[PDB]
Amino acid sequence: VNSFSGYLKLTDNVYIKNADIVEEAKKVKPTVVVNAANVYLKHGGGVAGALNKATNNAMQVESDDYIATNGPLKVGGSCVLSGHNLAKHCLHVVGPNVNKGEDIQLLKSAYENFNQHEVLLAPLLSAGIFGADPIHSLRVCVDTVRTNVYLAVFDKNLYDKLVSSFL
Ligand SMILES: Cc1ccc(O)c(C(=O)O)c1
Numbered sequence: 001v002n003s004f005s006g007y008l009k010l011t012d013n014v015y016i017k018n019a020d021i022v023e024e025a026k027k028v029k030p031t032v033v034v035n036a037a038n039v040y041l042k043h044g045g046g047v048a049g050a051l052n053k054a055t056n057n058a059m060q061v062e063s064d065d066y067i068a069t070n071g072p073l074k075v076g077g078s079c080v081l082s083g084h085n086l087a088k089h090c091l092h093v094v095g096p097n098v099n100k101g102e103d104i105q106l107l108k109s110a111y112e113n114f115n116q117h118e119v120l121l122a123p124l125l126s127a128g129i130f131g132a133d134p135i136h137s138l139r140v141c142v143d144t145v146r147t148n149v150y151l152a153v154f155d156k157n158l159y160d161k162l163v164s165s166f167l
Pocket residue numbers: 020021022046047050123124127128129152153154155
């Protein structure tokens with residue numbers, strides 16, 4: 001049993017809810033929250049900007065030190081950093097950004113990072129301002145992630161479309 005409430009079960013391991021991932025993290029304090037990161041861990045907008053704002057910029061301060069030591073992530077890659085006030089850990093995952101011309105085939109590699117964690121609270125990778133089709137992102141999630149993933153979809157209209165269209 002876990003603390004996640006009000007999710008619709010899509011598969012054996014994938015759950016979905018219309019929720020603000022920031023508000024959801026604050027309530028649940030999950031072991032792992034996933035950030036929709038970029039390779040520079042520059043948390044300006046979308047999920048990264050909202051998560052980072054909720055940490056009072058501590059996520060950005062930690063991230064800048066990580067990049068100064070390690071250099072940029074790979075598209076499709078990840079790193080584990082603090083979850084600050086939102087979670088034990090934040091798994092920063094880089095999905096391909098279609099609005100920068102990145103190979104959408106890298107979305108499966110991105111979701112494979114989730115399999116290193118038994119339970120996660122996550123957004124749909126490469127959705128929102130990363131420009132991918134969220135229906136596609138949910139299909140790759142279901143077909144790639146084998147651990148237990150709780151998906152927070154920000155947009156109510158999109159949430160209803162994802163559920164209604166799910167195969
Ligand atoms: C907080 C937040 C901001 C932008 C977004 O696109 C999402 C999401 O896709 O789930 C969430």
